[PDB]
């Protein structure tokens, strides 16, 4: 069916690690154009959409298109064996088995059984640095389990208050953190910090994150893996 | 009342972290000259005297003098959010609330409720490197809960023995560790290693530590934070 | 009896640390030529043979030959106090006490009581990089408690399978990992991963490891500490 090679096994491990913090089971659609995966977290709050085009792979050969289901927690522990300079080879041919090869000084091939997996009018859009978003969520985690997103004409505010203390992060476009802001009407919404904590991990300091959300509306978070691999989250608002 | 800015949020976090290992509650006197704090550990063995002059702050503006009480364990977790290059802003104006702002790529402002806090003839003086003192205490921690301090005319000895093993550290002025030694009469005293372990943390390898103590007498340990900020411990002798 | 000095206290600590993961009690024979130690793991599966010649020591003076018994777990915690650039001095003279001196900025001398300790036709030989052997064992640890060693005329295979998954590492001399291979007849044998995990720790990426084993036969693993200090393991085959 296919032979797929990814340079930098550790970074691919982190990518799967990030997803594994929200999902445990997922089906990967392997086509001629790339690898796509759409899964949902157990609490049905987060929709994860991962798109890995062939351009981010050193070698991409798919003889026949196929959808495979893997255990991300199982897959993660194997991918963590790879170093930063290691080469990752994803081979599939034994009908119901996935070959995971970590190639560095030597060639180490894992053999994993495949499993059966069952397969918005945003009024505010902002583009923020991954660092700022990461720090803001962690800050909110100290004071509350809930973080509020506020977007005005020329300012973006992330605010969280608890029983005793409070944290607030304001961005006004003239700052380094905020790169772009497109707001139609004043937009307020609150989300679970615990969820945002998991989907914010793996973010680089230079990563550009696009956030779309509305009043009492789910938010869409999107950034790119190696500039071509798209990772999109759809987070439901806090009840 | 005041606006105080400190460059290097992580180092300030470590300073509060060090104190938090001995005290949980403390009152900070904020004057025109600097910030001072005098608190005592729960076991009433250690007296901590911290002095932070305005010279170690990038911006020091105190409109009106005031004494504020904070939870160091609470304060510590917030200050740990700051990086090494981060900017720390301590703002106070809302009568009973302290604003803690971590400023790096973006501006993140915490809001913390203030709490109500209730506010020797040394015969031997030595000046030792922070590294030597740190290593000696940790060495003593392996063999005993008690460490003995011995100071002669031209030698300084830290010795600890347990039930089975023993460690000894001798300094004779001609060594790199000992920089100065002023001893009137032969001086012996023992102290709790657990306490010395906490007050020795955060010490640099180049820090100069001045130790004063006497026979069956409490010891005074003092070194400087950024060459101007004075940190002084008063440790009672072992019973 | 002797005064022995070793430059690089941290590396010596790691050496004792590695052995301590297999043995808890051992007798060290100190002669004019070097220090040797032969002990066995509690489960009587592994024989450890350590040889430390005088050439790896900065100063080696043995007045009288002697065999001393120490607690490696006790010894390890003391040696961990030493840094990479620290100097280690092993002094013995008080008949039943060992002096352990860590010398860096200052001189810290420990005093430890000595204890009383009670003192193959290989058909396949391979020389492999320490990195490859380390990675292979860790890979096998994920899928099974048993790892199989296979050596053919011009290929060396380490294979492990569990209940659901499988890992395989093939080396064919033309690879970077395999440096030499001398095989008489086809050789197969299996060993416990848990044991191999402990004796593979401390291995460098550039270390050359010589492995000798036979059909249903114990394996001999050998590499060198600082090119002169020989460390040899004798691991029994899996039942």
From Swiss-Prot, chains A, B, C:
Q: Has UniProt tagged this entry with the keyword DNA-binding?
A: yes
Q: Which SUPFAM superfamilies match?
A: DNA clamp
GO BP terms: namely: leading strand elongation; regulation of DNA replication
GO terms (molecular function) for this protein are: DNA binding; DNA polymerase processivity factor activity
PROSITE patterns listed in its UniProt record = PCNA_1
In terms of InterPro entries, this protein maps to: DNA_clamp_sf (IPR046938), Pr_cel_nuc_antig (IPR000730), Pr_cel_nuc_antig_C (IPR022649), Pr_cel_nuc_antig_CS (IPR022659), Pr_cel_nuc_antig_N (IPR022648)
Q: Name one Pfam family in it.
A: PCNA_N
Alphabetized UniProt keyword annotations: DNA replication, DNA-binding
Q: Which Gene3D superfamilies match?
A: 3.70.10.10
Family, as annotated: Belongs to the PCNA family.
Functional note: Sliding clamp subunit that acts as a moving platform for DNA processing. Responsible for tethering the catalytic subunit of DNA polymerase to DNA during high-speed replication. Unlike its eukaryotic paralog, loads on circular DNA without the replication factor C (RFC) clamp loader, although RFC greatly increases loading efficiency. Stimulates the ATPase activity of replication factor C (RFC) in the presence of ssDNA. Stimulates the helicase activity of Hel308 and may alter its substrate specificity.
**Subunit structure, per the record?**
Homotrimer which circularizes head-to-tail (head is a N-terminus, tail is at C-terminus) to form a toroid. RFC opens the toroid so it can load on DNA. Interacts with both Pol I (pol) and Pol II (polB-polC), with Hel308 (hjm) and with Hjc. Interaction with the C-terminal PIP-box of RfcL may stabilize the toroidal structure.
Q: Give the protein name, as stated in the record.
A: DNA polymerase sliding clamp
Q: Which organism is it from?
A: Pyrococcus furiosus (strain ATCC 43587 / DSM 3638 / JCM 8422 / Vc1)
| Lineage of the species this protein comes from | Archaea, Methanobacteriati, Methanobacteriota, Thermococci, Thermococcales
